[PDB]
Coordinates of C-alpha atoms and ligand atoms in Angstrom, one line a residue:
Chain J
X395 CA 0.0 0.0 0.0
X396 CA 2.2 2.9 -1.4
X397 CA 1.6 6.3 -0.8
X398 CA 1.9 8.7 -3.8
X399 CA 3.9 12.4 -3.4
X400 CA 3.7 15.3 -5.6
X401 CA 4.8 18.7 -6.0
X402 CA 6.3 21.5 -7.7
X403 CA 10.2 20.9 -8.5
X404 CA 11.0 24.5 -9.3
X405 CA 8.5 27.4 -9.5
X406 CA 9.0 29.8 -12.5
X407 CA 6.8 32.5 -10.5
X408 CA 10.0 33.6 -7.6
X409 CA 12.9 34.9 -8.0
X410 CA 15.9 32.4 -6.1
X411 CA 19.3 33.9 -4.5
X412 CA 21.0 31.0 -6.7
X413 CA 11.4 26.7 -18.8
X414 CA 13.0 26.2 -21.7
X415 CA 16.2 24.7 -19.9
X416 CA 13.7 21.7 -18.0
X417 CA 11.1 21.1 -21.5
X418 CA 14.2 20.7 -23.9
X419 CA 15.9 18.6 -20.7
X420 CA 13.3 15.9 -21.1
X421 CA 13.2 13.6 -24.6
X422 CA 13.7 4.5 -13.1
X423 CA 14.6 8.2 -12.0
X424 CA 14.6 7.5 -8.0
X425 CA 13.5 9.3 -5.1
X426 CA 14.8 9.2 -1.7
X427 CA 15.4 10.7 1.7
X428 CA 17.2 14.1 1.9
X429 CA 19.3 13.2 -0.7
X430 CA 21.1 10.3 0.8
X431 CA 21.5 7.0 -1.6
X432 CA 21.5 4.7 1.1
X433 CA 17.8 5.8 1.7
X434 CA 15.6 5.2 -1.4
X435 CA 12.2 5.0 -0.8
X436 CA 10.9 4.5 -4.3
X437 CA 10.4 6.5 -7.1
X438 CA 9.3 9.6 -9.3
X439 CA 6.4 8.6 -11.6
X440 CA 5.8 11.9 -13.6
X441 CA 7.4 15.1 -14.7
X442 CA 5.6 17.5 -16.2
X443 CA 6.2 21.4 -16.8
X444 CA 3.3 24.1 -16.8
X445 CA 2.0 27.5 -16.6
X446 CA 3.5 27.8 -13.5
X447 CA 6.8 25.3 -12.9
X448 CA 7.9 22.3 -13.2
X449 CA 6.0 19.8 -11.3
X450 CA 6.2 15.9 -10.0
X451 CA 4.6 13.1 -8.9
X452 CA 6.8 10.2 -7.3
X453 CA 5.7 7.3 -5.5
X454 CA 7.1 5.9 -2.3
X455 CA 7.0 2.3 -2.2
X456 CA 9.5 0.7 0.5
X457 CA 8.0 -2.0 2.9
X458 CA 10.9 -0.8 5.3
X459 CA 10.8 2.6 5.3
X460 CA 6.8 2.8 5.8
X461 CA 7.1 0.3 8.4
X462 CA 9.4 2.8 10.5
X463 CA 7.1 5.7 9.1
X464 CA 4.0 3.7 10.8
X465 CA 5.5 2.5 13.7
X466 CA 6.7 6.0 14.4
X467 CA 3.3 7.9 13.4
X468 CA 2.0 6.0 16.2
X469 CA 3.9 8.2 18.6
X470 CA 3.7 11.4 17.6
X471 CA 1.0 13.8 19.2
X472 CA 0.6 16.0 15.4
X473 CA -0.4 12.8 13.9
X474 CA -2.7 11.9 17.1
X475 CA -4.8 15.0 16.3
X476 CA -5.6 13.7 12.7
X477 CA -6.4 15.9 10.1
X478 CA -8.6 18.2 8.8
X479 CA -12.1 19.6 7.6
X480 CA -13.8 16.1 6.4
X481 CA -10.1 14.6 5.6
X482 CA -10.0 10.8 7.8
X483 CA -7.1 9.7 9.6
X484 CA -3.9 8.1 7.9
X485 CA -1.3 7.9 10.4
X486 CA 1.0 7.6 7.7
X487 CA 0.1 10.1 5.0
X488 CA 0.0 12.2 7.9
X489 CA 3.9 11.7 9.1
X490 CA 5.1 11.6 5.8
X491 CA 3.0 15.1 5.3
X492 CA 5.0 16.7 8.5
X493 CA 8.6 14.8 7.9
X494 CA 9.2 15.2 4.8
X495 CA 7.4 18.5 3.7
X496 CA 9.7 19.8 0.8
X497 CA 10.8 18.8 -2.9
X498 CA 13.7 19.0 -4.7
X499 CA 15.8 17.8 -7.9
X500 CA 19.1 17.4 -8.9
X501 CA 19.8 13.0 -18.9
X502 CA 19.8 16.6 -16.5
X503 CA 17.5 14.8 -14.1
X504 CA 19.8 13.0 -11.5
X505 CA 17.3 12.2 -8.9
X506 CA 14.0 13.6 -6.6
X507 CA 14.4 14.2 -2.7
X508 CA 12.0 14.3 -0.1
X509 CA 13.2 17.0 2.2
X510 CA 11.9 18.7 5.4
X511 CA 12.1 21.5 3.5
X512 CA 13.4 22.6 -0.1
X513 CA 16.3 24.9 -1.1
X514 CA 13.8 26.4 -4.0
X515 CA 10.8 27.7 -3.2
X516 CA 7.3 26.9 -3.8
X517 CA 8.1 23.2 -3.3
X518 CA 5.7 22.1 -1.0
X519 CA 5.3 18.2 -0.9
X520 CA 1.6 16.9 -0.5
X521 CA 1.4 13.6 0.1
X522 CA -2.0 10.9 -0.5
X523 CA -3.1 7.6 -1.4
X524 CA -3.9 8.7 -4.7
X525 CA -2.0 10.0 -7.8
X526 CA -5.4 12.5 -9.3
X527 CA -5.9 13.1 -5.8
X528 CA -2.9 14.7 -5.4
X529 CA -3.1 16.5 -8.9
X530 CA -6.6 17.6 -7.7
X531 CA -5.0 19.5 -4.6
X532 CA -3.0 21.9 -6.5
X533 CA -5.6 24.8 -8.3
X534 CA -3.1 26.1 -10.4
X535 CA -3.2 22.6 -12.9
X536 CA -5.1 22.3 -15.6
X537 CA -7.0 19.2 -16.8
X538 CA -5.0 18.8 -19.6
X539 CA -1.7 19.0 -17.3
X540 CA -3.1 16.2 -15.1
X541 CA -3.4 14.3 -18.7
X542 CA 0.1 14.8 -19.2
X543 CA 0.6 13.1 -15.4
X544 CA -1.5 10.2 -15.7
X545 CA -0.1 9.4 -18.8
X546 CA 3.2 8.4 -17.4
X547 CA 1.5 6.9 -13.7
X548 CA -1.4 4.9 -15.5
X549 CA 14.5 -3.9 -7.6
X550 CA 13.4 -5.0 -4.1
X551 CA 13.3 -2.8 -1.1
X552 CA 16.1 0.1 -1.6
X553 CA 16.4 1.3 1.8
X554 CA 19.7 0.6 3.2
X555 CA 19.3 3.0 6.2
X556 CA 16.8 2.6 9.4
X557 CA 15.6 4.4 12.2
X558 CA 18.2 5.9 13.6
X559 CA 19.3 7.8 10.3
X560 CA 16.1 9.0 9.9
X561 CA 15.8 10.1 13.4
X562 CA 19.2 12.2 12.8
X563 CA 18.3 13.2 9.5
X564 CA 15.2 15.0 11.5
X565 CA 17.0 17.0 13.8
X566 CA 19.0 18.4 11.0
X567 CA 15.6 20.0 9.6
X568 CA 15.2 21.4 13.1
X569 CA 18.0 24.0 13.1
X570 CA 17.6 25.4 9.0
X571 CA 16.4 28.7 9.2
X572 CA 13.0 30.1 9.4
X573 CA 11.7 27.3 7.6
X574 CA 8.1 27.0 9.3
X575 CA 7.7 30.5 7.3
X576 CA 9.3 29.4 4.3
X577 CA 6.5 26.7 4.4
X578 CA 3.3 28.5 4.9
X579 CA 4.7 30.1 2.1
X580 CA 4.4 27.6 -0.7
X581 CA 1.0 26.8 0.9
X582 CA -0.2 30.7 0.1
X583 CA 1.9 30.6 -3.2
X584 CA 0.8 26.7 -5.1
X585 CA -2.5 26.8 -3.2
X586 CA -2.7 23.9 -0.8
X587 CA -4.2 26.9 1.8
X588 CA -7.1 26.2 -0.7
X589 CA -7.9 22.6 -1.3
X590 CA -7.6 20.9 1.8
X591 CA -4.9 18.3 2.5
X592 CA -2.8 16.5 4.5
X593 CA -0.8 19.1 5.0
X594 CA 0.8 20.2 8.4
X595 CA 2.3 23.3 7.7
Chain H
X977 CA 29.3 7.3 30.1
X978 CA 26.7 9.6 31.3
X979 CA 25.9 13.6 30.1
X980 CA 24.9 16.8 32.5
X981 CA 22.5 18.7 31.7
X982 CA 21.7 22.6 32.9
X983 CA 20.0 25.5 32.2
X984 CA 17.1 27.4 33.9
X985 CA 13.4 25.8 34.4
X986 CA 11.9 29.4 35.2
X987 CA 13.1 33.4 34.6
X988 CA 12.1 35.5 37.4
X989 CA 12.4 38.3 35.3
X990 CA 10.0 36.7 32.4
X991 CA 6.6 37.4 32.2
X992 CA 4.7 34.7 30.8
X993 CA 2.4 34.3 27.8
X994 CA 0.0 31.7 29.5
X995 CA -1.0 32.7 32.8
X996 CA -0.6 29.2 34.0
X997 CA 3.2 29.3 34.4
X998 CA 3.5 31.5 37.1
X999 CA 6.4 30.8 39.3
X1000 CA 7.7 33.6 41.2
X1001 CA 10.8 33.2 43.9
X1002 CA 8.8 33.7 47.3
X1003 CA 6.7 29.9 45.2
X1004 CA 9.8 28.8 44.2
X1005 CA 11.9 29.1 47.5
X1006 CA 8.5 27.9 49.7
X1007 CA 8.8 24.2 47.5
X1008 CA 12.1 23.5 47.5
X1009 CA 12.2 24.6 51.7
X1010 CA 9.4 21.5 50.9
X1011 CA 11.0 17.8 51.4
X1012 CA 14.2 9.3 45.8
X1013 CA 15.3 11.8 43.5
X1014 CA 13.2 13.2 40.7
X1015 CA 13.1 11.5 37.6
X1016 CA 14.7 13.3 33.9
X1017 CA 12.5 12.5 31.0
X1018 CA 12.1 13.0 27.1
X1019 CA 8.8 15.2 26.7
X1020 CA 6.8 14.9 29.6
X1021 CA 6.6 11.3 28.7
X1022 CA 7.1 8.4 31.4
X1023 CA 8.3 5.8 29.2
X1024 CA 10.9 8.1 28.4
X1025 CA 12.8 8.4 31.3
X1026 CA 16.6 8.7 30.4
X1027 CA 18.1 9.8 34.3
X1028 CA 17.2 11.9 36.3
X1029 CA 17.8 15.9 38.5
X1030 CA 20.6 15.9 40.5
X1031 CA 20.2 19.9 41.9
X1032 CA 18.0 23.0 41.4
X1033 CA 18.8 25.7 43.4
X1034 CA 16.7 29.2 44.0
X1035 CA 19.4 32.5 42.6
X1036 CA 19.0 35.8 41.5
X1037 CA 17.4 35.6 37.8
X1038 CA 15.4 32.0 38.8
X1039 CA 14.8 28.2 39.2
X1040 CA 18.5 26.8 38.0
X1041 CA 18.8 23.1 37.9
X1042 CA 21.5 20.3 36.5
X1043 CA 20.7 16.9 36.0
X1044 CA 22.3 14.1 34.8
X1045 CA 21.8 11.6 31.6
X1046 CA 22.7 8.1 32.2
X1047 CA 20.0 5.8 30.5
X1048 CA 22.2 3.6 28.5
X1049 CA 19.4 2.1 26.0
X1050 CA 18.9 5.8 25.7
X1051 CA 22.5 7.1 25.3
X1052 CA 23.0 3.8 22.7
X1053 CA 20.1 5.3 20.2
X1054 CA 21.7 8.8 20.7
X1055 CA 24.8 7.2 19.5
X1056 CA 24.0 5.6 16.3
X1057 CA 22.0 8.4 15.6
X1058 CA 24.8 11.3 15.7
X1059 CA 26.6 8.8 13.7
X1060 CA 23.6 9.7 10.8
X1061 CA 23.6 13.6 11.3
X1062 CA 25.2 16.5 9.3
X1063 CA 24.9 18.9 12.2
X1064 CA 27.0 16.6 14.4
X1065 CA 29.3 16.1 11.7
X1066 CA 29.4 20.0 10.7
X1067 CA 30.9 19.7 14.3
X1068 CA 31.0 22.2 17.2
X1069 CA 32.9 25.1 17.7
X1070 CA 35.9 27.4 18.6
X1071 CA 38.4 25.3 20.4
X1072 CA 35.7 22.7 21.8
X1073 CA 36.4 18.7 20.9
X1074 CA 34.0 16.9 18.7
X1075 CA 31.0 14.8 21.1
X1076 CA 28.7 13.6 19.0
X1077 CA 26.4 12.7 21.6
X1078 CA 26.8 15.7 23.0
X1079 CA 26.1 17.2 19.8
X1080 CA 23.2 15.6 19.2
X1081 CA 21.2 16.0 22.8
X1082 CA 21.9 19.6 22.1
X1083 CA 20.2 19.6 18.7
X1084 CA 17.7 17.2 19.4
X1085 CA 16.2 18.5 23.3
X1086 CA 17.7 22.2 23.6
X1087 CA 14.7 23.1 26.1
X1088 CA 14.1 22.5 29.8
X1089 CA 10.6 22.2 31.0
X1090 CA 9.6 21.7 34.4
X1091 CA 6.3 19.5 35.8
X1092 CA 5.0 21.2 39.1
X1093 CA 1.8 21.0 41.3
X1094 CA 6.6 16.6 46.4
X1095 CA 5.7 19.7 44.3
X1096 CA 8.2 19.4 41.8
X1097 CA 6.8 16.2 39.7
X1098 CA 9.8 16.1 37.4
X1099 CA 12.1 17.9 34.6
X1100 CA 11.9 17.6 30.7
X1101 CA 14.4 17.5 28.3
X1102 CA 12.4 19.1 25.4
X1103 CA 12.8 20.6 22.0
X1104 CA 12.1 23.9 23.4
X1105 CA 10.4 24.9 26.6
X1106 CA 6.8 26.9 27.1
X1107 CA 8.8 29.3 29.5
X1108 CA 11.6 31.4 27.9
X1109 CA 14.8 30.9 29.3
X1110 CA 15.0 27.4 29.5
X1111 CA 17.7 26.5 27.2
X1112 CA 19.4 23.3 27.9
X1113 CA 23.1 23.1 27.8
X1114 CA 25.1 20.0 27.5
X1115 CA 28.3 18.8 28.9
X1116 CA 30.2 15.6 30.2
X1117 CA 31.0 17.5 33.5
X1118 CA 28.7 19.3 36.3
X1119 CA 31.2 22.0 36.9
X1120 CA 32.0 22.7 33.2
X1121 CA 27.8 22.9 32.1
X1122 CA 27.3 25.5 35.3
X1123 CA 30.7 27.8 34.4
X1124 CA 28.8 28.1 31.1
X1125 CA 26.0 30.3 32.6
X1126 CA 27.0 34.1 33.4
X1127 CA 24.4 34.9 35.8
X1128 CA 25.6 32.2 38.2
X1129 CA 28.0 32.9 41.3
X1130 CA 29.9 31.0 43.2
X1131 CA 27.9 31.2 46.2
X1132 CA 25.2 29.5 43.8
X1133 CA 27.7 27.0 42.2
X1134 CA 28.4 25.7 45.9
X1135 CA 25.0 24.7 46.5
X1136 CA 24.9 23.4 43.3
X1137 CA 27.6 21.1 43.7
X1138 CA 26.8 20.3 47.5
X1139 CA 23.7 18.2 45.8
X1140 CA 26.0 16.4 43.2
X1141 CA 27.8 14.1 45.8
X1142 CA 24.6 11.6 46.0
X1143 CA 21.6 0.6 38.1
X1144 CA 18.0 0.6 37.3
X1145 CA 17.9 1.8 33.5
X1146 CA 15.1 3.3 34.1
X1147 CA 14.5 4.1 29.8
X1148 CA 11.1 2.2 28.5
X1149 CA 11.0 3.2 24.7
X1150 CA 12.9 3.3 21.4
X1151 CA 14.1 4.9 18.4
X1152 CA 10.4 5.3 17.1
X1153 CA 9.6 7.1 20.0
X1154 CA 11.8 9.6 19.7
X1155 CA 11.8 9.8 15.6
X1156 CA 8.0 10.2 16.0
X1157 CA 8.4 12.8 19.0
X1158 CA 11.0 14.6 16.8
X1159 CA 8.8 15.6 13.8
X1160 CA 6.5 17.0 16.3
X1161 CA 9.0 19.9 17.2
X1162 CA 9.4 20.6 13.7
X1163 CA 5.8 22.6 14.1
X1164 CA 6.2 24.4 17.1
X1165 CA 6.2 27.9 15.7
X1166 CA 8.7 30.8 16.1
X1167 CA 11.0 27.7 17.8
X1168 CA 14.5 28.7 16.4
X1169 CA 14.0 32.0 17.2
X1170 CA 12.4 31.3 20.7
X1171 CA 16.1 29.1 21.4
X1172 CA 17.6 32.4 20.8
X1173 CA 15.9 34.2 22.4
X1174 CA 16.8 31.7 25.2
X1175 CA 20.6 31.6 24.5
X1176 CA 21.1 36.1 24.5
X1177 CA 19.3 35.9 27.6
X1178 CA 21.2 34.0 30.0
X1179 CA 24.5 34.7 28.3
X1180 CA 25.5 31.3 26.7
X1181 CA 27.1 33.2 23.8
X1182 CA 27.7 29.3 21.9
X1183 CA 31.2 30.3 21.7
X1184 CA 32.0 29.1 24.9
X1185 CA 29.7 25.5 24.8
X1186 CA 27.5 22.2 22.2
X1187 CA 24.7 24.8 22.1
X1188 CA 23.6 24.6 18.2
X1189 CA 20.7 27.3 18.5
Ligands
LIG94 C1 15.7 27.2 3.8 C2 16.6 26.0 3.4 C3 16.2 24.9 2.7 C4 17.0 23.8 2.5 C5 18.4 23.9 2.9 C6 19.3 22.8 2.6 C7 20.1 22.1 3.7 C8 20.2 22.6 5.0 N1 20.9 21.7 5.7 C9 21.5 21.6 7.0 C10 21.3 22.8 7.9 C11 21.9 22.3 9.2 C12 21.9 20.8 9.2 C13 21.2 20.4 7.9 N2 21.4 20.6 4.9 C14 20.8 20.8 3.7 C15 21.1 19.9 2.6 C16 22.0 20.4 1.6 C17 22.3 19.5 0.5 C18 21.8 18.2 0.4 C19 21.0 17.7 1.4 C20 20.6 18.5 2.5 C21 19.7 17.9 3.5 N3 18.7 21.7 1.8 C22 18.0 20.7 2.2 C23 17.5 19.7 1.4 C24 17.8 19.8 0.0 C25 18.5 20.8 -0.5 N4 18.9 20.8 -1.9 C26 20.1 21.5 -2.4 C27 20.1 20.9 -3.8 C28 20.9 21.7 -4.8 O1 21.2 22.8 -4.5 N5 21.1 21.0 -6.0 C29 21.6 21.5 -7.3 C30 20.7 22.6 -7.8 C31 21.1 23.1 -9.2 C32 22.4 22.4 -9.6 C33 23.5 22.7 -8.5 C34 23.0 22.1 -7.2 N6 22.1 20.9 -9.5 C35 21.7 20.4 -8.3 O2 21.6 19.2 -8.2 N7 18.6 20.9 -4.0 C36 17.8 21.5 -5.1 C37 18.2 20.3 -2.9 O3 17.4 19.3 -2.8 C38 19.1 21.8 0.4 O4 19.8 22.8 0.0 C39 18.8 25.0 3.5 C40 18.0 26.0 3.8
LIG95 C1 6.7 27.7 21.9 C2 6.2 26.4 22.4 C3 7.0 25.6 23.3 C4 6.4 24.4 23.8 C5 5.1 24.0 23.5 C6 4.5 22.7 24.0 C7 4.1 21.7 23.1 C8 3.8 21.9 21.7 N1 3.4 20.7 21.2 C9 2.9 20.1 20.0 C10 2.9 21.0 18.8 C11 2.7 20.1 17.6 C12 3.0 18.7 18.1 C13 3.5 18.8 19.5 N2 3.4 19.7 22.2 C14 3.8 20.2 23.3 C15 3.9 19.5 24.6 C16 3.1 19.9 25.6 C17 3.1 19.2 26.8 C18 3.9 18.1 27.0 C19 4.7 17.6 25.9 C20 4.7 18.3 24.7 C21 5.6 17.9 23.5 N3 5.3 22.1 25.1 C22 6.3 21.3 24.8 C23 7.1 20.7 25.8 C24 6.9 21.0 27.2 C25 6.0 21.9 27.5 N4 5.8 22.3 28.9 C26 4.9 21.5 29.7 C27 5.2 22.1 31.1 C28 3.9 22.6 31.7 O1 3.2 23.3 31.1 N5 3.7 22.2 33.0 C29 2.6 22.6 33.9 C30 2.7 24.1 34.2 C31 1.6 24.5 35.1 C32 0.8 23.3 35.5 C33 0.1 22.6 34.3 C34 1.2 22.3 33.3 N6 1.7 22.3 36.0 C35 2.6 21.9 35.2 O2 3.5 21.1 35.6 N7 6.1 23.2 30.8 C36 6.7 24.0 31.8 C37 6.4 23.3 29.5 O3 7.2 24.1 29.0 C38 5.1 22.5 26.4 O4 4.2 23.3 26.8 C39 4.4 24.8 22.6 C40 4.9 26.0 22.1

């Protein structure tokens, strides 16, 4: 029972302190924790560009990591509270949602990291147990955009690390800078303040 | 090995923002003038018990405790997990020597938070602390984590140290625990800034100690 992820990658819109170079950069790309081989989760399943950015849709897949990701979820007080609005429970969805808030990338395309938090902005990472779900959180797509996505989404376990990388991985993401503004910020930017989500920021 | 622990509970000179963490010296001095030894735990949790006080002691700006780390289950996790953390390996500062799980108690539970109605239920390494001033600091020696606070004086350090002259791993959890517990802080808001806060006020400068705020 996977869970799907998907974002913006890189968001034409702001300005960094850092279109045509990611459409002409396209005609197994993996996705992992923070960057860290030893700590592939799964995969990307989509790329796609738009109006907007680029945007991404990978799908986490590893019987290892969401067994720590569940056992975990079960004690933390955020995911106790549940979600929102008429949202139901998922213990995982939700830690995933609150862990891992933040995209990022690295052919051109090297590989897709969850993050706590992403070095460009706009990168917010909704997580979901469903691929047009996920598409159908972010109001800046189009229909024909989420054709473009489900045309691509319709090994073994990868994960070398365990817990305790994971758990120092996360206290990492505590001490980057103002990054609980940075991520109310893609909310009020891609629109995930508007369709409700699983979202903790 | 075990790890000290130190830093203010409560600031006298701090006003609140709940109204429910009131304590004032003539409350403070009343309690411990009140008569085991209380327990140290990870977030107001009891299964998470890692040692426990060793000393708190009334002074001039507030409610100053140390306490001591010795859960080895506990300290074990620690371990392996500064082993698997950039801010550990970044490393700490000045002329200080690398302690990884120094390091990583300082990143991970940089807050004191005291339970109080035996008043004083028990202390609470935490991420950060509802009262400001209650940054934790870190050190493998009693003497060395109370020489790190400025507003201390000797006269203070003496009762201090007259409590530190007093096997049951006491720790009933796991890695989970504290990876779950850990993305929990990551949504306390203004937190980074609120450790800051903390450290400007009762002068540990960093310059001088593991603190990573
Ligand atoms: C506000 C903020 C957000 C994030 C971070 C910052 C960070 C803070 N700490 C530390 C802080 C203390 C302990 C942890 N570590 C990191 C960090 C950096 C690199 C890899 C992993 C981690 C965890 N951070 C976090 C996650 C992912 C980041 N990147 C950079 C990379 C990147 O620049 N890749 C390039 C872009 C263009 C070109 C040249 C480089 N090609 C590429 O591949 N990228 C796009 C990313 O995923 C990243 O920069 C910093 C601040
Ligand atoms: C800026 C900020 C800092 C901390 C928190 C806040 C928090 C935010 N989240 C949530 C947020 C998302 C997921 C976790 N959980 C907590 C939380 C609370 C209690 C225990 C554990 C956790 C993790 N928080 C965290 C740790 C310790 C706190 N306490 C409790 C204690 C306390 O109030 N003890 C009392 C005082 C008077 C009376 C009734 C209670 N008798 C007592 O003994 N104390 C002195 C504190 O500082 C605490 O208030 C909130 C904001």
């Amino acid at each position: 029972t996977p869970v799907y992820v998907g974002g913006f990658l890189a968001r034409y819109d702001q300005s960094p302190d850092e279109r045509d170079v990611v459409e002409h950069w396209l005609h197994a790309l993996p996705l992992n924790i923070n960057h860290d081989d030893t700590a592939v989760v799964g995969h990307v399943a989509a790329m796609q560009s738009v109006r907007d950015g680029l945007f991404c849709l990978g799908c986490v897949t590893s019987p290892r990591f969401l067994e720590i990701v569940r056992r975990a979820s079960e004690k933390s007080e955020l995911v106790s509270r549940g979600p929102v609005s008429p949202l139901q429970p998922d213990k995982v969805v939700e830690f995933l949602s609150g862990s891992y808030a933040g995209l990022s990338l690295s052919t051109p395309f090297k590989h897709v990291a969850l993050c706590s938090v992403g070095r460009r902005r706009g990168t917010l990472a909704v997580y979901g147990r469903d691929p047009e779900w996920v598409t159908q959180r972010f109001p800046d797509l189009t229909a024909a955009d989420r054709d473009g996505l489900r045309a691509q989404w319709q090994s073994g376990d990868p994960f070398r690390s365990d817990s305790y990388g994971l758990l120092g991985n996360s206290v990492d993401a505590l001490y980057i800078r103002e990054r609980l503004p940075k991520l109310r910020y893609d909310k009020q930017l891609v629109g995930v303040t508007e369709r409700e989500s699983y979202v903790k920021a």
